[model samples]
Target: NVMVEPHRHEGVFICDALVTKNLVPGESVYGEKRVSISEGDDKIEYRAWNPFRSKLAAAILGGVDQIHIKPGAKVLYLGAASGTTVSHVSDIVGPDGLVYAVEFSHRSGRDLINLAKKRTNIIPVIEDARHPHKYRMLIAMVDVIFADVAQPDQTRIVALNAHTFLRNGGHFVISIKANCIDSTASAEAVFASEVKKMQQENMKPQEQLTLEPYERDHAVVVGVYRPPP
Candidate 1:
């Protein structure tokens, strides 16, 4: 019988050597492939988590040291367009955890709302990520802030939001699009500049990794938002 093994970190599962998360007991969302194994007379199921579809998964495949997003942790996901990645994040966080998915586009926000209906763990907030104050009423102190905004001045945008809601000692998982920042600059140069900017904001970068093949000129950076005294 094929069995799914738990990764060293929480909220990550490996079976057939693929990362997976069990959401619904026996149903698949968004048509993602599902896997299962038998335990005594009961059956346990899991959904195959594809790195090609999720940037966080790609970072893990690309050798990131820590994800910082474990089950039961509150996460604030920025630029949650259409809820594709947000759904998988919801799975990882599980029921005990919560994901405040913020989106700026109303069209995409509609889709996020519908997706949230199926998964109560996700809270779809239709608001601009740049102006975190607008939605301050809906958010509380969060453990992690995962941003995929792809804006040129994403460093400032993240810093603003982090100051508004992220708890001290919280971590950040940001995906940078090199072309968005500067097409003429080398990917490495762009990443380096971003790291420098983050340091200026007191965000200590921990690790960086490139998302090759899946996405060119792309990288994911993990960092501590603000260190303790």
Candidate 2:
């Protein structure tokens, strides 16, 4: 019998693989595998989340302490390339929550917009993450911000959005690609440098984990925004 159990993180599931309850049953987003489970008269579907394709999944498989994006929690997802991971995020956040997905590329944004049509919880914002102000009118204060932008100044990008949209005591999950920031530096060195930058921006990092096996030269940092005094 196929079995699915809830992950430690809310709204996520596992059946020898990470899975999320499909918000849209019978629809495959990005051609991922889907599992169906029957409980009494109800049948539920779960989508397999590939760590290789999504840094957030890699972070979870790497055993990062916290994700902070849970049921009914609003999130600002940076670098939402075609909504692959954003779809999983939408599944996690459920109907009450919202995922404000920002992508700079109009090409990918088209796909994101399509995904948003079915997954109403996702709001696709096709704009530069460097300028959160550009789409500030479209977003409300979010509970978490998940950034996978592989820019040299990615930390600053997250910080700027944090100041604008993240609520006090909110959390953030950032996926850092070392080569994108500084190929000359070691991966560890680049991760350290990004952590320091987060601190300077009033973001307090809680845990850092590398996405090994799943992704090379990539790390995810989880932290909290401005804490209450």
Candidate 3:
């Protein structure tokens, strides 16, 4: 599993879209990240994006191994705070793809706005995740929905968005924190229950992995909304 840590300070971190290797930088590229793409032997350069503040980088570096989101894929990213993961996600989707970043925090929305200015693929919408219809005009049928809402009703939030945006056979990737699901229970127990909640919403769980070393009692679940892709 690759590791995506913001541990490097005053140094740069390079994410290779070709070899999928993240290299430590001797020079600091703080507040900006560099993404390199390869076409056979040729390398293409896009605007740099930061990974220090995004969990998507961690999931990629940590190697969850189930993200179906890639170039040319349309995605609905819920809880896109500060557009951190949204930036890496935009990088993954490239210029042909589009990412609708939905953020509710006004402060983070400011940062997201700035990022959207550089990456036209990202459309930052400052809105609550509980209601997808509120921003229906801004979105279209999507290939996947990656959510990290981190709310007490995250399962419900995801379900609502899935119904509105996710196309048939689309995927749903969510970051689940056990304590947030249920504090009184064991971490494993809480995630298990949350999986069931997603199951009830028609998201069939395919695989799950623990984000150990980087986080505690946290798991990323990958599932299909309908089944049989």
Each candidate structure's TM-score, on Cα atoms with residue i matched to residue i, is: 0.93, 0.97, 0.79
Candidate 1 residue 169 C-alpha distance from true site, Å: 0.4
Ranking by lDDT: 2, 1, 3
lDDT of 1 by residue, 1-229 (tens): 4467787668787873555576666656667778777778987677777778778878776778888888988999998998878887888899999999999999999989998888889999999888887899999889999999998898899988888888898999999999998889999999999999989887889988899977888999998987445
Q: Rank the candidates by TM-score, best first.
A: 2, 1, 3
- Name the candidate that leads on TM-score: 2
User: Pick by lDDT: which candidate is best?
Assistant: 2
Error of 2 at 66 (Å): 0.8
Tens digit of lDDT per residue, candidate 2, span 1-229? 5489899999999985999999999999999999988889999999999998998888898898789999999999999999999999999999999999999999999999999999989999999999887899999999999999899999999999999999999999999999999999999899999999999998999999888899899988899998445
Candidate 3 TM-score versus the reference: 0.79
Model 3 Cα lDDT, one tens digit per residue, 50-151: 323455555555666668777788999998887656766776676788999999999999988987877778889899989888998889999989999887
lDDT of 1 at 8: 65
Better of 1 and 3 by TM-score: 1
lDDT of each: 0.85, 0.94, 0.73
Q: Judge candidate 3 at residue 83 and give its lDDT.
A: 66
Candidate 2 deviates by what RMSD?
Answer: 1.3
